[PDB]
Write a protein that binds this ligand. Sequence first.
Ligand SMILES: *[C@@H]1O[C@H](CO)[C@@H](O)[C@H](O)[C@H]1NC(C)=O
Lengths: 198, 208
Amino acid sequence: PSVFLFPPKPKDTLMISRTPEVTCVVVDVSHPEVKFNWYVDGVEVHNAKTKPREEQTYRVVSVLTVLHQDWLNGKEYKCKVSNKPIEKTISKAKGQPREPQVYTLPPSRDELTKNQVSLTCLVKGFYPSDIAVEWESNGQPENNYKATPPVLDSDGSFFLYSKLTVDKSRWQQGNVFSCSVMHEALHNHYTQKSLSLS
Amino acid sequence: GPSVFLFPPKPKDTLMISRTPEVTCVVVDVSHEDPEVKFNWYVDGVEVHNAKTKPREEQYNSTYRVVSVLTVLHQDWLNGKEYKCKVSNKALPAPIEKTISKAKGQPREPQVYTLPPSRDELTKNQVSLTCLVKGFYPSDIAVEWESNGQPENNYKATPPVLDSDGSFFLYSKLTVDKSRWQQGNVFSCSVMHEALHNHYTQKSLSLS
Ligand SMILES: *[C@@H]1O[C@H](CO)[C@@H](O)[C@H](O)[C@H]1NC(C)=O
């Protein structure tokens, strides 16, 4: 009945050493088997790997490795599911890519009454939405941060915010935190900004 | 065969007295052959009759999407009333029932923090004022911006995101001419949520 076709992880398409994949997820299957057909700009490929079956009905996932440049150039990946057929497609959005602007914002004066404070990373003006944002300090990832999903801005670019939560004492001490952003329009697909008490 | 989805009211509708919150019952994959759907609606088990039936809209794969809309009293949504949709159709062997209500769980008041633009952005012709709303439950909220009495043209909120303590947060970005910011003009983030006193709080932001 139901088919979902996810794109590759942003970080996996921008680092050459990682391996980006398109995942075609079928759910709500009978007790049973399913046929996958895969196409790249209309042309069938047979290198996709089907994962083991996953219960509750049954969930079946097929994973196709994509070439980094095929995705960034924006080839279409089409998944066809046949069973006792539904087609789904995905692709990097068309349009002039745009460099993200990364701004780190310290916590509000008001938040300093709380045991934990929020450090905020604003990433805006970027296209397409595919992006990866991470927090770290002293060359180590932080335990507790989350980002919003990308949101479409009025100019047709995307933005998002990443909220890092830390113990106040750690911020008041003078520790430096850094928001790392990875995106295709960035030189080296990578930029970092820092933020510390001052 | 046909499937049934029941949607809650848009959050801004449940929080403003001038707006019309409604629960929406959506039946998809209704056939061309038997396109007739009977809706029954109940609130805490009592049948109600004021629901509105929308014209069916055909999916060009020769099926219909069929929708019924029940307007809800702001206070009943707020107090935890269950809304029930029962759907009947020739294709179905038994009618299908779905129940929806406001999210259960101890309500929590939003903390509201306005943040100025980063130094770096003052480079630009427009700058971003930011309103961080965190700590809140349930997720239904409304965040708006204004100054000097008027609402602001150019802003957008993220959706609410589930934080790690089981509360929600979200951010609202307001964009303004750098000039307006430099000049000391005062901007206010407003926030409407059930757990706030009078369901409303307001926080300001200027050159500080
Ligand atoms: C027809 O199209 C709609 C719209 O995408 C889809 O939700 C529905 O499942 C389809 N029904 C079919 C193919 O019978």
